[PDB]
RNA sequence: AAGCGCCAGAACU
RNA sequence: GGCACCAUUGCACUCCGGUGCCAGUUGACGAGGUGGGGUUUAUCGAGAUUUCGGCGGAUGACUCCCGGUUGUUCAUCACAACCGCAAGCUUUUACUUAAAUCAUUAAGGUGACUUAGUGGACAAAGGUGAAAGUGUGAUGA
C-alpha cells in the first residue's frame, strides 16, 4: 500500500552518504517536497535509501516515473515503504 | 616563550 | 573520515561486518631555571582514559676547571663551607598574579576534535628583601 516514504535499493554502495543524499535530492525533488532523505552505509542498510515525501501523491509519481532509472550506473528499484517514517507519524 | 617541539606505536574519527 | 579487495540486494528512523592501505585527530597544566669542559635516566608541584609510547630539544644534577664571595680591618698562603655578576650555617618572616583540570557558552570541523571567551578555586620547589642566633688559623701594617 502507498506511503509517504519510498524505499530505494540497488543503489551503488561505493557512493558516500553526503553525495548519495544530494544526488537523490537532485533527481527526486521535482515530484514534491522532500522532508528528509535517510541513508546509511552499514552492512544491513548499504545500497538503500528512504525518501520521505510530504505528500503521498508525490511518492507515487516518484516510484512510478523513476522505477529502474540508471543512477550511478545501476538501475534503482523503488518500493512503497513497509511502515511510515516516524517523523511522518508524529 | 622550553612541561618545550614534533608524531612513526597506541587509541579515537 | 577516505580508497581497494572480500563479503552483503539488505525495510530503516541512539550510531554498529572483516582485512589491508592512506588520511586526519589526541599526544605537558603552569612555577622555576644558562661562566666553560665532561658525564648523565634534567628541577617543582597541579591534574588524573595517553601528562601513555617514540623522537628531538633543554637553563637541571654531579664532577673538573677558571673567576669570585663569606669565615669582622686590610693585603699573602693554605684551611672550612658557598657563588657564576650571586656568594658560611641554624632558625623563623612576607613577597614571588599559578595555569590547566573543574564548571559554563560561542565559533570552526562530516567527525575525532580545535580555537576563544566567561566563572570560581586550590600548589610545590627555588628564589628575593627584611628579623633573632651560632662559623677559622699562619705570617705582616
Ligand atoms: N622540564 C621537563 C623535564 O623535567 C623533563 O625531564 C624533560 C623530558 O621529559 P620526558 O622525558 O617526559 O619527555 O622535559 C622537560 O624539559
Ligand atoms: Mg604547557
Ligand atoms: Mg612557564
Ligand atoms: Mg612523553
Ligand atoms: Mg626523553
Q: Which sequence spans correspond to the domains of chain A? A: 1-90
Q: Cell numbers of A26, please?
A: 537532485
Q: Cell numbers of A13, please?
A: 554502495
Report the DSSP pairing between strands A49-53 and A34-39.
Answer: antiparallel
* List of residues 6+ apart from A21 with CB closer than 8 A: A37, A39
> Rounded distance, CA A81 to CA A1, Å?
8
Domain A1-90, classified CATH 3.30.70.330, yes or no: yes
CA of A56 to the centre of ligand 3 (A): 66
This structure's resolution (Å) is: 2.5
> Rounded distance, CA A82 to CA A14, Å?
26
> Rounded distance, CA A45 to CA A83, Å?
16
Minimum-distance nucleotide, CA of A88 to C1': C13
Beta strands in chain A (DSSP E): 5-9, 34-39, 49-53, 70-71, 74-75, 77-80
A82 touches strand C (CB under 7 A): yes
Q: Which method, experimentally, gave rise to this model?
A: X-ray
Amino acid at each position: 500500500r502507498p506511503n509517504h516514504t519510498i524505499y530505494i535499493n540497488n543503489l551503488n554502495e561505493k557512493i558516500k552518504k553526503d553525495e548519495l543524499k544530494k544526488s537523490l535530492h537532485a533527481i527526486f525533488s521535482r515530484f514534491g517536497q522532500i522532508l528528509d532523505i535517510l541513508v546509511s552505509r552499514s552492512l544491513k542498510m548499504r545500497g538503500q535509501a528512504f525518501v520521505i515525501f510530504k505528500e503521498v501523491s508525490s511518492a507515487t509519481n516518484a516510484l512510478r516515473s523513476m522505477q529502474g532509472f540508471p543512477f550511478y550506473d545501476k538501475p534503482m528499484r523503488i518500493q512503497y515503504a513497509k511502515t511510515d517514517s516516524d517523523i511522518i507519524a508524529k
